[PDB]
């Protein structure tokens, strides 16, 4: 019916009203102290007062760190921007890694603006241009004005345009009998389609037929928009949207990441603060999630040390499964979790714990009931012993071949023999390594 | 056509109970790997789960790529099967993670339902009105069948499709509305006064009778990555062929995911996931593995098949050694299908099948000696020797390869063991690793 | 290796006459019903009845009397090979490319 991939049995942290975690809630089993710390972090993010707060999720493999970050994102809701990221994303061939890090920092901060739009709309009735007295004079264009007559439901207006709006109108390929949509903030024109007041069965252009827009021609409507700061920076650095030749030639060029200067960021911040002071916009800070943080270089960590001290920084969540490991880009610096000691001071470490046999068994139970499979009790005990013997994940993804082998025998029951066949057909890391050691030519 | 390395494998050779036949469908032997590949094939065909990594491991010349080709041929039509190598990720204009993201998104197909209208009939009158320069174009078309006759209106693209592929009155054309394609089926009027400008010999077709306008429902499969490249910029359809899609932003991918879910929620489109095959996956940086470990956990993720012929070797980007050249985090989230070496009867059957595909009439003793030299040396050498033995055999003008031509081909062309034997006793003739050589013969 | 059959029409332009229609439409001038073009090559001379729609191709490539042109059969699409060699001494000073008169017939089929 649905599609499932390694998650989506997790619906949140599953806490109480006081911050106490239940044993089985939200698809989580165990990890009580980590879930309580994550709930405290969720409350801190929802307070909307702090800047540049960093936590680190430190534990072994298959202990539930990405699951906890997903639960953080699900608990915060879709209004708060969440930016998932791996450590290998920051190495770009178009721009330096520092700019990619700052771009993700500004992408993790949201905004909510209520915008007023001046709108002309209607069905085009009369489209008559007027000519210039000397059109080959070198300066000045061919026409002078274009008269456009629009009609609506209980309304009809005639507009006199300068040529610049008419160039967009002509680029939209409008004619007489079309319903158009002119917005006055940027001069953009949208052509909706043919009016339904004429015949609709004599075309060959697979176009749809709309009726007349209700209300008057000239309106002022309120639109609530959700944007980020990186959208404002990107729109200002590569300007498209005007009707000047720089804007029209900006759309035709191939896009490329540039190094956005700090001056543009300060001016965008000043404009956003002026919008907030007018009661128009509101600020929604969010979370940046960086997975496999040990893949970063020493330069990226050194820039993070300065980027966390800014006054507009979001909450940063990191995760790593490393012990005493040399930092990449250095040769002798041995540090906990592969993170240098200058960053650990600005951090709050949340420690995750390994599981038990019963926790493995019930995690396999929820993963079986999410994938729409039913197993026997003895097969479940075999899977739990198998998960303790080899890995939790190997017991997790052996469920689907067992289900396929159960289906191919015309049964809707997973039994011990299907699990034995799945063992015989698929190996794990330990048995493959044991085959590799006792091999002739790297078998 | 032409003969390839795995041209004899079209399918997997499995029964209705996923049990392999000993010799079927171009595949012989390797029962456990074929059964596991059939299980993975049904896992793909169900389409209910995503982001599962499968590793195929074994010695060289065992049938890993043969297994991948059998899976691809049993997959059937309109299911994406992206086959890449590990060396293609490193590019000068794309990051490794961006190239891996594009390779992931190539393997997810979207099947879009569309509603079209087909129009066929004789053309009565074409009127085309154009500007003085020639930009603005409009006109009317009067098409006609035996029973009905209507007048349509034309646009710029329709007039462009009418002008090229020249249509006159009396020609029979077929128009598809949603594709914008005009095909000329022939001519029926046979106009007498023909200006002798062209050498047209157009076909005589009959009058189409019945309804002028007919509706039909068409289905086409598009990839996800094609939708990102199309929506990325103004001329992305050119970038689909030139490959100039440089580092598509994340906002495009988020909005495309949202619109794909919206199209699924209405019934216009459905998601058909596919198989991404990575041959020589050990030829990858550790940052690629760290990206793969977290890109396998997404909703839009295909089933990934990887092949390795490597033991405990060095992992690239690091300074330690790991099994299969892969880190243990990637090996944690993978199930492993192993492959075992062949017997003499399996090698004989392989050589007989490859001789049947290449159309070579081998003798019995020639087949026995080819099996002997394929069990002492490798299988690919004895497979390569067959065409050379055939080309030697046509020099004597007999269409049957004897053991003499096989012996001549074995004499003329060398194996690896004979090559290292010849090199290791004449080390002065060849260039040393220190760059020293002896050129003079005295 | 691709093989193809070409039907061609080349030679020096002898006459170039846009024939008018019998009943012209209102609001227009010079409504072409067809175009008469006469060709001249070595041991060959042939006049042609053509489409009205090659008149724009005549006017784009600036084809006049005395030029030697190249008419593809199916697409029309005339093009100017150059000026005939007999007009090389027409003007003291000029900037043109005079090409010899083409050999063979006006109409030929070549694979």
């Amino acid at each position: 019916v649905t599609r499932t991939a390694a998650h989506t049995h997790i619906k949140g942290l599953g806490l109480d009203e006081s911050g106490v975690a239940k044993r089985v809630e939200g698809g989580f089993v165990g990890q009580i102290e980590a879930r309580e710390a994550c709930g405290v972090i969720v409350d801190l993010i929802k307070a909307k007062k702090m800047s540049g707060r960093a936590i680190l999720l430190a534990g072994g493999p298959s202990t539930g760190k990405t699951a906890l970050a997903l639960a953080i994102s699900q608990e915060l809701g879709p209004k708060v921007p969440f930016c998932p990221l791996v450590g290998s994303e920051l190495y770009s061939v178009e721009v330096k890694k520092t700019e990619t890090l700052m771009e993700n920092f500004r992408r993790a901060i949201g905004l909510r603006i209520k915008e007023t739009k001046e709108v002309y709309e209607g069905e085009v009735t009369e489209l008559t241009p007027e000519d210039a007295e000397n059109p080959l004079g070198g300066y000045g264009k061919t026409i002078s004005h274009v008269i456009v007559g629009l009609k609506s439901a209980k309304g009809t207006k005639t507009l006199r345009l300068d040529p610049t709006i008419y160039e967009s109108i002509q680029r939209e390929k409008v004619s007489i009998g079309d319903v158009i949509y002119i917005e006055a903030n940027t001069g953009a024109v949208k052509r909706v389609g043919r009016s339904d007041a004429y015949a609709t069965e004599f075309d060959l252009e697979t176009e749809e037929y709309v009726p007349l827009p209700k209300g008057e021609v000239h309106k002022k409507k309120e639109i609530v928009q959700d944007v980020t700061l990186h959208d404002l920076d990107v729109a200002n650095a590569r300007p498209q949207g005007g009707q000047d030749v720089i804007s029209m030639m900006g759309q035709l060029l191939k896009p490329k990441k540039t190094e956005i200067t700090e001056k543009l960021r300060q001016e965008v911040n000043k404009v956003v603060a002026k919008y907030i002071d007018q009661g128009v916009a509101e600020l929604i800070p969010g979370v940046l999630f960086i997975d496999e943080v040990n893949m970063l270089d020493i330069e990226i960590f050194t820039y993070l040390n300065k980027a966390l001290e800014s006054n507009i920084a979001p909450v940063v969540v990191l995760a790593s499964n490393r012990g005493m490991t040399t930092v990449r880009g250095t040769e002798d610096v041995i540090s906990p979790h592969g993170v240098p000691p200058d960053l650990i001071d600005r951090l709050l470490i949340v420690r995750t714990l390994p599981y038990d046999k019963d926790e493995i068994r019930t995690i396999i139970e929820r993963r079986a009931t999410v994938e729409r499979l039913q197993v026997e009790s003895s097969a479940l005990d075999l899977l739990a012993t198998m998960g303790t013997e080899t890995s939790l994940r190997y017991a997790l993804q052996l469920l689907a071949p067992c289900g396929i082998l159960a289906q191919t025998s015309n049964r809707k029951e997973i039994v011990v023999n299907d699990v034995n066949e799945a063992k015989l057909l698929f190996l794990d890391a330990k048995r493959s390594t044991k085959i590799l050691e006792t091999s002739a030519n790297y078998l | 056509s032409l003969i390839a390395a795995h041209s004899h494998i079209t399918g997997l050779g499995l029964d209705e109970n996923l049990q392999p036949r000993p010799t079927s469908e171009g595949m012989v032997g390797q029962l456990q790997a074929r059964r596991a590949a059939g299980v993975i094939l049904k896992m793909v065909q169900n389409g209910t789960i995503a982001g599962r990594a499968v590793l195929v491991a074994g010695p060289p010349s065992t049938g890993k790529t043969a297994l991948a080709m059998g899976v691809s041929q049993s997959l059937g039509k309109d299911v994406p099967f992206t086959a890449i190598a590990g060396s293609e990720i490193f590019s000068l204009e794309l990051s490794k993670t961006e190239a891996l993201t594009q390779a992931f998104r190539k393997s997810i197909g979207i099947k879009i339902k569309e509603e079209t209208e087909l129009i066929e009939g004789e053309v009565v009158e074409i009127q085309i009105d154009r500007s003085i320069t020639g930009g603005h174009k409009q006109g009317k078309l009067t098409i006609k069948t035996t029973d009905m006759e209507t007048i349509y209106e034309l646009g710029n693209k329709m007039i462009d499709g009418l002008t090229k592929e020249k249509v006159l009155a009396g020609d029979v054309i077929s128009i598809d509305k949603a594709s914008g394609k005009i095909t000329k089926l022939g001519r029926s009027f046979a106009r007498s006064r023909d200006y002798d400008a062209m050498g047209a010999d157009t076909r005589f077709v009959q009058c189409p009778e019945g309804e002028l306008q007919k509706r039909k429902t068409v289905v086409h499969t598009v990839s996800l990555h094609e939708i990102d490249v199309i929506n990325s910029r103004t001329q992305g359809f050119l970038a689909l062929f030139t490959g100039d899609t440089g580092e598509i932003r994340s906002e495009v991918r988020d909005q495309i995911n949202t619109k794909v879910a919206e199209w699924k929620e209405e019934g216009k489109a459905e998601i058909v996931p596919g198989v991404l095959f990575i041959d020589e996956v050990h030829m990858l940086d550790i940052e690629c593995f760290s990206f793969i470990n977290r890109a396998l956990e997404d909703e839009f993720a295909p089933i990934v098949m990887m092949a390795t012929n490597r033991g405990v070797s060095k992992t690239r980007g690091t300074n330690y050694k790991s099994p299969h050249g892969l880190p243990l985090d990637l090996l944690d989230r993978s199930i492993i299908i192993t492959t075992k070496s062949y017997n003499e009867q399996e090698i004989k059957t392989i050589l007989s099948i490859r001789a049947q595909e290449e159309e070579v009439e081998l003798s019995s003793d020639a087949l026995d000696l080819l099996t002997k030299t394929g069990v002492e040396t490798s299988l690919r050498y004895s497979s390569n020797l067959i065409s050379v033995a055939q080309q030697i055999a046509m020099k004597r003008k007999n269409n049957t390869v004897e053991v003499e031509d096989v012996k001549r081909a074995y004499l003329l062309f060398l194996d690896s063991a004979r090559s290292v034997k010849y090199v290791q006793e004449n080390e002065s003739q060849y260039i040393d690793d220190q760059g020293n050589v002896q050129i003079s013969i005295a | 290796r691709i093989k193809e059959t070409k039907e061609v029409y080349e030679g020096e332009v002898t006459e170039l006459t846009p024939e008018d229609a019998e009943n012209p439409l209102g609001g227009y001038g010079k409504t072409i019903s067809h175009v008469i073009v006469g060709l001249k090559s070595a041991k060959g001379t042939k006049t042609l009845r053509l489409d009205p729609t090659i008149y724009e191709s005549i006017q784009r490539e600036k084809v006049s009397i005395g030029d030697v042109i190249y008419i593809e059969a199916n697409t029309g699409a005339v093009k100017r090979v150059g000026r005939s060699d007999a007009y090389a001494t027409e003007f003291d000073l000029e900037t043109e490319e005079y090409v010899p008169l083409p050999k063979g017939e006006v109409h030929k089929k070549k694979e």
């Binding site: 007489i176 004429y198 015949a199 | 053309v123 009127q127 009105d129 009155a169 | 227009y28 001038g29 072409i32």
Partner: peptide, 28 residues
């Protein structure tokens, strides 16, 4: 009732007529 057709608006523009017996081309 029958809906009217869309108005056709071609002044100052050329015309190519392709009929059964004979073809035109009107130019300015």
């Amino acid at each position: 009732f029958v809906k009217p057709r869309r108005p056709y608006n071609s002044e100052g523009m050329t015309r190519i007529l392709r009929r059964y017996e004979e073809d035109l081309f009107c130019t300015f």
